[PDB]
Amino acid sequence: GSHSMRYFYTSVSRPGRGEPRFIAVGYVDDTQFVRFDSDAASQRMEPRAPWIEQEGPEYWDGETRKVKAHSQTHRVDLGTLRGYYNQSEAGSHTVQRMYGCDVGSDWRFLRGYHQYAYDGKDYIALKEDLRSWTAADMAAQTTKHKWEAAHVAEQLRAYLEGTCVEWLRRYLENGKETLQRTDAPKTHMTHHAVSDHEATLRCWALSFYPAEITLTWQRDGEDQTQDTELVETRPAGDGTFQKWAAVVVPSGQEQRYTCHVQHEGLPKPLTLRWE
């Protein structure tokens, strides 16, 4: 039962159309709880979960100040990277930043993450030892030199082993009713004849939380991938998730195939057979 807290920032330049569009989102595991949009009228960090509204004005003022700072630094980074790659002002470019921390089922610190990307492409990242940086190209090398000079790694490690984990624990306790719950996947199977000699078996897992789930197909008890098809886990919209896995079988041999479901909300993984 590990948990995580994650902050995502996206900044998209709009040449000739004003300032860059900035969107920030905060997640605890698979639940979004804060949000900032530079095109919104509020100009403040806004709640997205009910358990974060307990925080007083000091928390929201501080959060709004830091999200403004992230917006400003991203805007400056856009022009800086435009200079690093000798790019003109005609093109629209995107800078993304993500950072956060993981804790185990004991809520002990596991790992911290801090990384950037430019135009959909990896740029710089904190290494696993939380002591150094990995640069994806030779401009990120200059960024890494700047960050090593300023000893950014130590301040970041202090944040990741301190404020990040402590406030993740605080949110998991204040939102205990929804962050620490586990919704088992409600499963069911569908049958559809595709021809006179073949059919399609689709097993569904619905209304589960968290999003991590495993759906596998077995024929005669052996893993099968030949005529199988899985969809990406998708949000239902009410806070839970959905997924299904299908397989094409010879009509009349449905009993040879089983669908195996693995999730945190189920003590024993489920086995679904058509009949």
């Binding site: 902050y7 905060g26 928390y59 501080g62 959060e63 830091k66 999200v67 700072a69 992230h70 630094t73 400056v76 980074d77 800086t80 990277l81 800078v95 950072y99 950037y116 740029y123 710089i124 960024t143 700047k146 960050w147 950014v152 301040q155 970041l156 944040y159 404020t163 990040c164 406030w167």
Partner: peptide, 9 residues
């Protein structure tokens, strides 16, 4: 809670 430092590429 977010990070305090004013970081630039």
């Amino acid at each position: 809670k977010q990070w305090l430092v004013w970081l630039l590429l």
